From a paper:
The reconstruction of particles from the first class reached 4.8 Å resolution and showed an asymmetric holo-complex, comprising two c-MET and two HGF molecules (denoted as c-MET I, c-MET II, HGF I, and HGF II). The distance between the two IPT2 domains of c-METs in this structure is ~20 Å, hinting that the two membrane-proximal IPT4 domains of c-METs are likely to be positioned in proximity in this specific dimeric conformation that allows the intracellular KDs to undergo trans-autophosphorylation. HGF II, however, only engages c-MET II through the interaction between HGF-SPH and c-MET-SEMA; thus, the second HGF is not directly involved in the c-MET activation. Our cryo-EM map of holo-complex shows strong elongated density peaks between the IPT1 domain of c-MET II and N domain of HGF I that can be assigned to heparin, based on the size and shape of the density as well as the local chemical environment.
C-MET receptor, which belongs to the receptor tyrosine kinase (RTK) family, plays essential roles in controlling a number of critical cellular processes such as cell proliferation, survival, motility, and morphogenesis. HGF, the ligand of c-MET, is secreted as a single chain 83 kDa precursor protein containing an N-terminal (N) domain, four consecutive kringle (K1–K4) domains, and a serine protease homology (SPH) domain.
Author numbering:
A (entry chain B): 26 to 107, 111 to 304, 311 to 626, 634 to 740
B (entry chain A): 34 to 55, 59 to 290, 302 to 344, 351 to 384, 389 to 430, 434 to 469, 495 to 722
Write the structure that this text describes.
Amino acid sequence: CKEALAKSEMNVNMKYQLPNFTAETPIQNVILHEHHIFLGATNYIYVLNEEDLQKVAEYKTGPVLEHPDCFPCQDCSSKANLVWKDNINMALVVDTYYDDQLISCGSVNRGTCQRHVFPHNHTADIQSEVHCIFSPQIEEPSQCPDCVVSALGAKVLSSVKDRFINFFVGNTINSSYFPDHPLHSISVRRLKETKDGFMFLTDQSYIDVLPEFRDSYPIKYVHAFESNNFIYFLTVQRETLDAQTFHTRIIRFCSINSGLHSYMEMPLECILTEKRKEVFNILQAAYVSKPGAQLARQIGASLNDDILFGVFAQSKPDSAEPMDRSAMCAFPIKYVNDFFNKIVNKNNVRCLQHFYGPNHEHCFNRTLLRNSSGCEARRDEYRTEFTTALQRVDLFMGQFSEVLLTSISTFIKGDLTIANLGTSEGRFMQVVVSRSGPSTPHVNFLLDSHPVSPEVIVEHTLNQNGYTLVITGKKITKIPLNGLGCRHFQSCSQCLSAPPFVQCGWCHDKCVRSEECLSGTWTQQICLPAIYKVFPNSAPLEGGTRLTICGWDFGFRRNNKFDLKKTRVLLGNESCTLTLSESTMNTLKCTVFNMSIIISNGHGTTQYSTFSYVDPVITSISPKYGPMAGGTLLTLTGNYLNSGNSRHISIGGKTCTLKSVSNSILECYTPAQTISTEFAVKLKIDLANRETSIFSYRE
Amino acid sequence: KRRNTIHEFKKSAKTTLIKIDPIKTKKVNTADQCANRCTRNKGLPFTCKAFVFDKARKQCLWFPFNSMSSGVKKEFGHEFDLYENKDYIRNCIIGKGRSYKGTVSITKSGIKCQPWSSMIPHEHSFLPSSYRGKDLQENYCRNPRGEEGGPWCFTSNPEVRYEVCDIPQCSEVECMTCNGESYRGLMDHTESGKICQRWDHQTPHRHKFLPERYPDKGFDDNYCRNPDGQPRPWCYTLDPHTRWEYCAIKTCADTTECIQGQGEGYRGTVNTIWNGIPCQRWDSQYPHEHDMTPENFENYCRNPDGSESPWCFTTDPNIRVGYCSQIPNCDQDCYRGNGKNYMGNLSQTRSGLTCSMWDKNMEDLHRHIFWEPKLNENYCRNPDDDAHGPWCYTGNPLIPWDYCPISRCVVNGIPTRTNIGWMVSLRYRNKHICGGSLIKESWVLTARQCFPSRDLKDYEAWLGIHDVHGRGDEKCKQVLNVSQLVYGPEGSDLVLMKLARPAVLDDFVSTIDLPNYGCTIPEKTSCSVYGWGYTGLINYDGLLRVAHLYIMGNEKCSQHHRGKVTLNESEICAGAEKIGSGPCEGDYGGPLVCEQHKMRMVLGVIVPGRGCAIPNRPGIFVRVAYYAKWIHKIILT
């Protein structure tokens, strides 16, 4: 039996009270700074304590009244007419290069942002200072400089380059709203020292789709980061202007204050390939971090070589949504940089579809000096679109291929690395990552109905004090990365599979920390076999029948595998038969006066005192007379008739249809025979041949 | 019914045809429907040998002639696309060759074919009127009935009536290589005689390969390709029921340790994975059968499918694929500011140019400078022990030498009473942006952060003005184009401009002397800065505005920054007199000038950073003396 022992695996649901805070409105972004965590949520902003998990203060960008004549920060309080919209923060950043500043951004106010200051004595007040970054472009009102945040999609990266604050923003915008307000899909806003506006340094400082396709070609930006003086963007789009399919891409460009000079895009796919193929199209979340040492060997990198981890989900047929099927895939920065620079040949390179246009003179007769130029800024830049994609394999080998992962974060501990997966339902988990094999989730509990937001914050001071901040629906939670407990482990195998940093050990009854054994028998090296049930408990020393053994921890404890060859089963001196095909670490099969059974796995042994030496016997039948057609119930009696699995009761080679079998009474109906005389009945318990009282036919 | 036959046509991109001595256009949405019309019998009264469509035109036009027809002009028209009938191009036999249009009119016996219009010497020549659209030409032999024998014609020879023309099959010319992907030929027929559907189409198979998405692999109309690395090319079947079929082609006739690429072309006798588990041979399917076979292309770690790493099936049955990741793939100074200490194996410059011929380099260096009486030709090593790092001479006539990139360890403005010619107003887009300092008759310096553009035909220099655009003195203002700009050393963030023509000196305009290279500044030394830029006033009349500045050391700046900045010898700190006043936007590249005793001289350059003049907070400027020797070296040009 397998389901009867469902107590084997870790109890997937057990409730914990974590440091948590509830929001009145959905939360969009999160920022940590100086033991203060800032939460931009629907129309609101909050400040939260790092340890206390208490709202220090809050401020409202509440329900927004809009007037067509009204400008984003011009006074409009006296307006008695109008829309009643709601601002939500897609772009939130803390900057410290100039001063301790928060740049927040609302969705409705023409995508205009606001600036807030902190006093030194009190580094948490935000209502003290409010500052619109709203510079009237009297020079060229054709382009709105401070109109930055697109209401449809926004991804913002702030950085400090050449002693200026630079904002690389990728904005998804529909063609409908373009004439209302001119925006650019990808732009670089550089901060004025006066902190009152931005300047577009040149025309080539921005790149955006040609107007005709601004309805088609949906480009949604999902991540951005910086490495090796490059700004990378992970974003989804169609395969081509015609495909209507979807696939994600990496975008790199050189961060010169002027604008994007060397603009490259390359398509990324992650595939589950087996011997003698599932491709994940849509990226769900991403996170770049330093790798684990074992992972450093497994991927060929150093402890400082930065690796990007992406959650990829297969797209719906000609649609951007997934089928709730997700995987995690790793990409070293060195390999992707080299693929961009050297590996791809010349003729595969193409011109940008949405920017250049197929019927235009550049990619007619323009080429690249790929091998002889890298990040070089030339005024007649050539925007490139590689057609050769980069493929990688899921390191989990599809351990989550049936479920969707909504978010992901990573951290490391000694030689190993642990990923903080977030499930579409909101089932946060932590799992050790390794190419060795699938990893059991040492924590799997369900948090909330709402999905886990892609906004996730990690922190680990001193490699001792660690915790992650996770948003979900209207609640944020601080989950320490030091584990929660060892009690939930319900098998020695599961208990020992736990990472060393959580002190898990079987205390002869259940897994627990070392100090918590009253009995002092804490163990972390051996798995004593445990018997759940035996089917059945009676067999002769020669009688042989199918024997099912339900239990746990039968297999030899190896690092990942659990072998059955390193196990013996004995009926005292006699050894019970081993059927390794039907015998597992969980279940076993044998086919052989109360007696005990000793099962010795690769580490320990256990005795089961229920087996008995009996033999079925027969006393009488009823009745003795029956017609030619048969069909007569034989109230067969005896003892040990319920030992062993099966009984064959037949007369003249034709089965007496068995209706009921018990230890004391047996019943069968005779079939229609061919002669009418005095015959006996034959019983089989698969080895114990037994004859009974003769039964006479009539006609 | 309603059928499709463009799958039998060819296709060309961005082309159109014009016959000088000739054909009708109709508005049709689908060019495929037009091609079907052209094939469909009686559809066009003429013999539609080709078709042309333009999506922009949405116009459909058939040509009764091929591209091979004499007197036609090909025009490279992006919007127009050509669809040619491959039968005239086939020049071979498929099956019975029912629709054969070959321009062959000879028999195996070499007697000329009897014309199909003249019924002598044999009278079975009513077929030109019997069968419409079958394209039996004046004399060329066809298969009007699609008879199994092939193209047969009547002989003008009397004794023999008709004989089948010997015309080759199509498999004769199309050979095959083991890889298959390299092959790109003319077969468009599957192994069972089916025809490959249009790779541009999406019906009746909604496959994955998109020819524009995946170019470079011959994803043409219907010609067989090997995209998935099969031993043979295959194509999706025109039949909706048959998913895809292979293409029958006869075969053609007539290693290291380091890793190149991802191991595709690489072969290696090593077959041990990082786990150390070896791998079995390709013949031995043990433990679990592997699809790949040697006939498709030992027990080594190869890459038949061209994955990221070569993979060989581990002897362990549980692991299907193991990757030998231990393979190696074929793929700077500190505290030594003098390049003589390190032998830099670098033939490149910071700008990316290669070096020059070191013989003439040594000759010119010795002639120019005789500092001291070795190194290798064309390398990062330098003889002069330059503090800014190793460098190398360059062959560029404009610049003969460049550094080799190896890592080694006004707010509250008071207007000026008079005008000073040391300032240069950076004019781009016909307006001031930044301030520059005049060193020579043809040399200015400013900050690197004042150049949105890397070109020069847009910038402009305006000199000798007391106002923003010289609103006062139009009599003496001067305009000069920029001839060259040069970026400073690593982290210097300074640029040197030589103008299109040196400006003759005058009382107003002034060139400025340079600091002593080893000089140091005393604390609190008052100096002056000049600017046209932002001042915070309600109205900037554009007049030159002056401010006074005072030196402070690393400390008071650092506590004023509260540890924000860790200062360096490349930097000079100086702040105001506890009042709110300092450089801001529009003043970048402005000069800080000071005197030893009487002769005033530039010590600093206004650089953007850390806000505009926060009261009681000193500003940071470059050390001009940190580069004075380098400027003296570059002045040789």
